[PDB]
């Protein structure tokens, strides 16, 4: 096991038939982070629902372990997951259609595994609502940090964290395929949630991106500024009908360099002058994912 097993052509989760929403979110969530590892480990309890075990076993044993030891997962295994998904929610295109990661997270975490809600929020002084991720919503600076968006979205609905989340997935402010509130967003490397708690820090570990119809992923695999990878479950294709896709994972240290710059410096930079894969991280963010700090060394 090692970084270099993860990197290359024919690495990551092989996409197949509109699967990129699923491939990329699983890659974000499990390629390097362990924030949700327990979800793959909690024993079946009597309150668990029908496919609990088959699903857990599939994720751990045929998806995540191979991803982590071999650097690669065949589309057949994802397709097995998608069928289970479709059996839990029929006629919702889980085996063939473009979907939202939100849809995927909710069926998987809420219905099948029965993950305790990741976020507990109180529209302040009211009582708590449960969710798995947070939607930035607010009224239209040109390049905001995700720190600002979270603060602004919280103030806009008078919200607070009921308790400190371990895994905070934040959805960027977009309205369909055709509208982005912001042309570029600065994904804060660290989030300070102190002034948003009822009663401190979190570290960026992934960004799930999409320009209009294909999801890809950026992942932070170490504390170093340059320790970023990019994953496309459909980087290349072989064949025609019975053709198959070739996923790719690539080092993208430039991301680290652009995130040493300020929002206003990035704002002045034309997206066509942004190098490597960094353009997509800065312009196409869909979800930013934060965890209880494990990679960092406090100083």
């Amino acid at each position: 096991m090692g970084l270099e097993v993860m990197v290359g052509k024919k690495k990551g989760i092989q996409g197949h038939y509109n699967s990129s929403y699923l491939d990329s979110t699983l890659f974000c969530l499990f390629s390097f982070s362990s924030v949700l590892d327990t979800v793959l480990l909690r024993p079946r309890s009597k309150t668990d629902v029908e496919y609990y075990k088959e699903t857990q076993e599939l994720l751990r044993t045929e998806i995540v372990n191979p991803l982590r030891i071999h650097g690669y997962v065949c589309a057949t295994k994802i397709m097995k997951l998608r069928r289970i998904l479709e059996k839990v929610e029929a006629a919702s295109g889980f085996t063939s259609e473009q979907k939202d990661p939100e849809e995927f997270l909710n069926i998987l975490f809420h219905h099948i595994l029965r993950v305790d809600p990741l976020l507990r929020l109180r529209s302040a002084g009211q009582k708590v609502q449960d969710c798995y991720f947070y939607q930035i919503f607010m009224d239209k600076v040109m390049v905001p940090t995700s720190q600002q968006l979270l603060e602004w979205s919280f103030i806009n609905s008078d919200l607070k964290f009921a308790e400190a989340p371990s895994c905070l997935i934040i959805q960027m402010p977009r309205f369909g395929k055709d509208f982005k509130m912001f042309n570029k967003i600065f994904p804060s490397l660290e989030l300070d949630i102190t002034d948003l708690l009822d009663d401190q820090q979190m570290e960026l570990f992934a960004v799930l991106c999409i320009e209009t119809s294909h999801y890809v992923a950026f992942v932070k695999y170490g504390s170093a500024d340059s320790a970023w990878l990019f994953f496309d479950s459909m980087a290349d294709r072989d064949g025609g009908q019975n053709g198959f896709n070739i996923p790719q994972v690539s080092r993208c240290p430039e991301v680290g360099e652009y995130l040493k710059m300020t929002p206003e410096e990035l704002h002045a930079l034309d997206p066509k002058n942004i190098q490597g894969y960094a353009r997509r991280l800065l312009c196409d963010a869909y979800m930013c994912m934060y965890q209880s700090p494990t990679m960092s060394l406090y100083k």
């Binding site: 038939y17 929403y21 009211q126 969710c131 309205f175 459909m234």
Partner: protein, 148 residues
């Protein structure tokens, strides 16, 4: 009673509704009002995504309440356009994209003008006014690009 539904795009949409109506119901009104299909709609109140089977009552939504609307952002694939030398370029598209605007995406990515682009699929040359869906391209697929 009246409620307000604010889009992320800045438009506020006002709706006549009753305290016990379902989230399904509200969505249908929004469709009729703005043409957004209900399966794309995500309604939020107080940071809480509102579930289809429950009522306004159930989320304590009342007189003059404002809701947030955001749209699902579906995705999954990328088509491939290959040259004969074996070089590949990828594009994000919908089934409903015209061949014209697929070429326009190629003009935007690489330099090439659409007048000089011959796009081929299943041995057939692709005509500008048709869509990808006309040619049964419904997921990641391979087109050939030949130059004129």
């Amino acid at each position: 009673m009246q409620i307000f539904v604010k889009t992320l795009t800045g438009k506020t949409i006002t709706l006549e509704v009753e305290p016990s109506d379902t989230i399904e119901n509200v969505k249908a009104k929004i469709q009729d009002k703005e043409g957004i299909p209900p399966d794309q709609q995500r309604l939020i109140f107080a940071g809480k995504q509102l579930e289809d089977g429950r009522t306004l009552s159930d989320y304590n939504i009342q007189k003059e309440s404002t809701l947030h609307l955001v749209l699902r952002l579906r995705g999954g694939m990328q088509i491939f356009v290959k040259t004969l030398t074996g070089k590949t370029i990828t594009l994000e598209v919908e089934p409903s994209d015209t061949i014209e605007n697929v070429k326009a995406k190629i003009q935007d990515k690489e330099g090439i003008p659409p007048d000089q682009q011959r796009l081929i699929f299943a041995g057939k040359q692709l005509e500008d006014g048709r869509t990808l869906s006309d040619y049964n391209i419904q997921k990641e697929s391979t087109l050939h690009l030949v130059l004129r």
